[PDB]
């Protein structure tokens with residue numbers, strides 16, 4: 287009855303929130319994470335938040351590149367599907383440390399895919415990214431549109447998608463959904479869990495949260511010469527909880543027989559600038575964010591936001607939270623957990 | 628002093644020989660997936676007095692401890708990275724294998740290189756990174772897009788190399804896009820000796836010619852070419868080898884790309900006929916559908932290499948097939 291899901295990277299931001307939705311949705315979930323960018327605390331708190339559904343969560347501290355540890359996981363539990371969140375995701379770090387990114391992201395993915403194939407679990411939901419749209423010629427960005435990458439991190443997402451496409455062409459038994467996330471922000475509304483990266487955050491809103499509570503001295507704004515309304519980059523910010531719910535919608539979709547290797551955007555379809563996000567955070571928090579204005583971050587797009595039509599139609603899913611809610615819940619988490627777990 | 632990955636293989640072996648004859652020292656790592664030690668035993672002997680400057684070891688590039696031991700024992704001035712799987716058709720059926728072997732091995736290799744402060748690299752890329760070209764000849768700056776997993780591993784590895792160079796300008800990297808090497812050392816003492824069922828055209832032909840396979844299967848006869856078969860840029864392997872010596876010299880003044888081809892297109896049937904001319908043997912053919920992932924017409928622009936490496940291919944098809952036959956007839960079961 288109760289379907290069993292392995293969640294790589296499940297102790298991380300998106301993963302932790304999604305694990306909780308899995309548990310509240312009736313799923314059993316086994317998490318695999320090496321705590322490279324997270325801690326044990328997140329799943330401890332997910333377990334509590336999940337109440338009696340907490341029983342259905344197991345967790346192992348395993349690197350996906352550890353084939354023997356991973357085979358062990360797959361030998362002992364019959365997984366209905368895998369959600370693959372595990373990886374490194376900081377663009378800036380990626381340009382500086384490309385091999386770390388190729389190593390962790392591609393080697394960890396290939397090893398997972400081989401192990402899945404060996405133990406007969408060929409249902410995959412992959413954490414892809416709007417970065418694969420590169421510098422879009424046209425917005426909104428549709429699943430049909432041209433893909434490219436502009437930095438090493440983005441290439442790992444692009445290359446993995448391509449690998450999944452080849453795996454599928456090679457072997458018709460695979461069912462794969464490539465979810466292209468836009469920019470998840472916010473925290474579970476209880477404020478008991480949220481984003482807590484190790485060391486220096488590379489995403490905008492956790493960096494802002496950390497300036498707000500006093501742990502970083504300023505936000506650096508990467509680019510004020512964009513051809514946008516305020517000169518800063520425009521992106522599609524989605525509530526992490528809506529993004530989590532999208533994963534429950536993806537898992538239901540794997541039962542469709544037509545599914546072979548399919549792409550869905552998970553975004554809101556609305557574009558918000560960097561300064562609008564900062565303004566919205568200042569509103570929610572009552573705090574000032576000191577800004578240092580700098581140049582473009584190498585590889586950044588100007589304007590990127592989602593077409594939501596395909597996900598609405600085929601997944602029956604649409605984001606329900608606006609920016610104000612995103613900032614409200616982020617601040618609710620951070621005010622009481624200024625330095626994370 | 629040069630580390631040669633996949634040096635027991637076809638192109639590796641010939642290149643290692645040229646390295647030894649040109650005064651270099653060579654360490655070879657190979658996991659003998661599509662070769663044996665025997666090839667290197669013969670290069671050593673063929674290399675004469677220079678032979679004692681060759682050393683070789685059974686090592687998988689994915690075996691990081693084994694590969695570190697190698698780098699810890701010798702300071703390398705450069706690496707030449709030939710190791711990998713290379714069959715377009717195999718790759719379509721077995722993508723994870725190709726991604727596992729080609730990418731995990733390369734990534735591991737590059738990390739160890741950096742760890743041990745050897746940041747000079749020549750890489751075996753491929754014309755398959757041009758996918759199905761919309762214009763020929765294929766120029767280094769023409770569009771890069773693969774149509775199969777093998778091609779993608781090559782394309783991906785190029786991109787990883789660029790990123791590596793961008794992250795750290797101490798790296799000097801040359802990406803050689805080989806077209807279709809064929810032939811053998813003109814002595815006939817070394818040549819292509821793949822293990823397992825051959826995948827490439829000419830080792831499949833040579834094995835049909837000596838009784839080891841019953842027929843050659845021709846992959847596609849409805850292409851938009853003179854005789855209906857796919858057209859490639861076949862290049863003598865000794866020419867290719869010499870190109871790598873020139874690449875090593877070029878490293879001493881970047882992440883640069885160079886085609887190594889002849890710039891002439893030859894169809895599959897023309898290659899068979901050239902081989903029948905050289906060998907006197909008749910090759911039974913079975914005509915079949917297109918091989919998944921195959922381009923139609925691929926050939927090289929030779930300008931950039933000529934201009935920048937002072938290198939041109941000098942052997943023709945006729946010399947490629949003679950040398951091939953010379954090796955085949957004297958080593959019908961290879962090594």
Ligand SMILES: NC(=O)c1ccc[n+]([C@@H]2O[C@H](COP(=O)([O-])OP(=O)(O)OC[C@H]3O[C@@H](n4cnc5c(N)ncnc54)[C@H](O)[C@@H]3O)[C@@H](O)[C@H]2O)c1
Nearest residue numbers: 295298299300319320321322323324349350372373413415
């Ligand atoms: N956050 C975003 O804005 C965004 C946008 C698009 C795509 N994504 C993708 O979503 C996924 C999750 O993102 P997140 O925001 O939750 O990041 P995160 O860093 O919180 O989550 C990643 C998790 O993976 C773990 N991990 C990393 N490498 C691992 C390995 N080799 N073995 C095991 N565990 C490993 C980390 O410790 C962490 O818990 C990533 O793949 C990321 O690329 C994120």
Ligand SMILES: NC(=O)c1ccc[n+]([C@@H]2O[C@H](COP(=O)([O-])OP(=O)(O)OC[C@H]3O[C@@H](n4cnc5c(N)ncnc54)[C@H](O)[C@@H]3O)[C@@H](O)[C@H]2O)c1
Nearest residue numbers: 633636637638657658659660661662688710711713751753
């Ligand atoms: N037409 C062609 O032959 C052609 C064209 C373009 C590019 N290339 C590339 O040139 C290189 C050499 O081609 P070749 O014709 O000499 O092939 P080959 O199979 O004869 O040589 C490859 C060698 O690599 C070794 N090897 C494979 N995986 C290894 C691993 N993980 N660790 C260590 N050694 C490993 C094999 O055992 C073999 O000796 C390859 O990277 C191939 O993709 C070849």
Ligand SMILES: O=c1ccn([C@@H]2O[C@H](COP(=O)(O)OP(=O)(O)O)[C@@H](O)[C@H]2O)c(=O)[nH]1
Nearest residue numbers: 488489490493506507508519521560583586
């Ligand atoms: O410290 C930071 C982090 C991000 N950004 C900008 O905020 C937007 C969102 O960045 P993030 O890295 O979170 O998302 P991405 O678009 O890279 O997935 C982008 O335009 C970044 O240039 C910024 O100005 N400062």
Ligand SMILES: O=c1ccn([C@@H]2O[C@H](COP(=O)(O)OP(=O)(O)O)[C@@H](O)[C@H]2O)c(=O)[nH]1
Nearest residue numbers: 715826827828831844845846857895918921
């Ligand atoms: O048994 C074979 C092997 C190859 N080929 C064709 O001969 C050419 C050379 O292919 P090969 O595998 O040698 O190299 P590739 O061009 O894929 O690098 C291509 O058109 C192949 O389709 C063929 O018809 N039969």
